[PDB]
């Protein structure tokens, strides 16, 4: 259980930053509050 | 145990053994007295009763000791409510068989009826009179001499059982 639970993590964060990159190329400016990850700063990506 | 081909008493630390088998009692976090299962290995193990003579006059504190005295109820003693549900052939005892009849039969099991009647038959067959004195050689409490025949004989016919020295194998306590 533990393994696949902790691998699903790295899977989904790389998926998340991917979709965030593809949301930043279309010009959409996303603030930090509406994101689920809120401490995330997209300028770092 | 054998020193120089001669049988001598050793003092074995059984405590150490219990901690070998169940190492989890060594790891203590301050909720753990009340955790539901004490060893995830043997989950049926609940209390370990330590029987050792401590000669200090002060008893142990009431939380490491079980209450053995006085009335246990108000309205009726629950042991005699329970004894109605028990039947004489319900097994209570198990003894190791040094020479198992099959590979299967490990411990052979006795009932109320078995024990009481074994002791009564022995008691009757010899002869026994109230408070006549009748002895038992030690280390027989593991087989149906000290476990069954002797004390139930002493009970069924009024008699007085007597233990000799706690052990046998060494010449000195012979």
């Amino acid at each position: 259980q533990f393994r696949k639970l902790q691998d699903t993590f790295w899977s989904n964060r790389k998926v998340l930053v991917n979709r965030v990159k593809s949301m930043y190329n279309q010009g959409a400016r996303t603030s930090a509050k509406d994101m689920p990850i809120k401490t995330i700063n997209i300028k770092a990506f | 145990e054998v020193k120089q081909g001669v049988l001598v008493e050793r003092n074995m630390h059984f405590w150490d053994m219990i901690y070998n088998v169940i190492p989890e009692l060594g790891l203590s976090y301050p909720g753990q007295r009340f955790q539901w299962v004490h060893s995830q290995e043997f989950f049926f193990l609940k209390k370990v009763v330590i029987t050792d003579h401590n000669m200090n006059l002060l008893g142990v504190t009431p939380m490491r000791k079980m209450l053995v005295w006085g009335p246990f109820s108000y309205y009726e003693q629950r042991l005699r409510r329970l004894s109605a549900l028990l039947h004489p052939d319900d097994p209570i005892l198990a003894l190791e068989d040094p020479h198992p009849a099959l590979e299967d039969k490990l411990h052979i099991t006795y009932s109320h009826r078995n024990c009481i009647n074994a002791g009564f038959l022995f008691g009757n067959l010899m002869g026994l009179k109230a408070e006549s004195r009748f002895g038992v050689m030690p280390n027989h409490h593991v087989d149906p001499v000290g476990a069954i025949v002797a004390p139930y004989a002493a009970l069924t016919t009024g008699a007085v059982l007597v233990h000799i020295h706690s052990d046998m194998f060494t010449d000195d306590h012979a």
């Binding site: 964060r13 990850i37 809120k38 401490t39 995330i40 770092a44 990506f45 | -």
Partner: protein, 140 residues
């Protein structure tokens, strides 16, 4: 046997700092009509000095600014810089911080791995303990 030294040196520094703060505090107690005495001073120093760093993975923790104020920088004794574990209480362990930035997704994995190097963490720590660092006088 660091902390043993560190609380002695904190006792040393602390009243030296009282010397400069006493003006502000005595100014304050006249308006509030509070009592100026040891019991006030010590709970004054407590809020200045003791500041706990929290899990840092929370993000609500790493945002907390109230320990960074000007008075709180001036009245604080230096004891944290003498013992490594005191420093690790007030802030956290230098590596644990920079990886926590990666945890709260406030940094790229690469950017973290870059500066996470032992050599760096050494120098940042000694600089921090000694009172040497960089300011960007203009933040953002």
């Amino acid at each position: 046997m660091n902390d043993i030294y560190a609380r002695r040196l904190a006792q040393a520094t602390m009243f030296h700092q009282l010397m400069r703060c006493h003006g502000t505090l005595w100014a304050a107690t006249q308006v509030t009509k509070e009592q100026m005495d040891y019991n006030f001073i010590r709970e004054e120093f407590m809020r200045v000095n003791g500041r706990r760093a929290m899990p840092l993975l929370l993000g609500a923790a790493a945002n907390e600014n109230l320990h960074q104020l000007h008075l709180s920088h001036l009245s604080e004794h230096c004891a944290w810089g003498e013992s490594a574990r005191a420093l690790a209480v007030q802030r956290q362990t230098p590596l644990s911080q920079r990886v926590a930035a990666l945890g709260r997704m406030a940094e790229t994995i690469h950017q973290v791995k870059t500066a996470s190097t032992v050599q760096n963490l050494f120098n940042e720590q000694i600089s921090c303990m000694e009172g040497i660092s960089s300011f960007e006088e203009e933040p953002l």
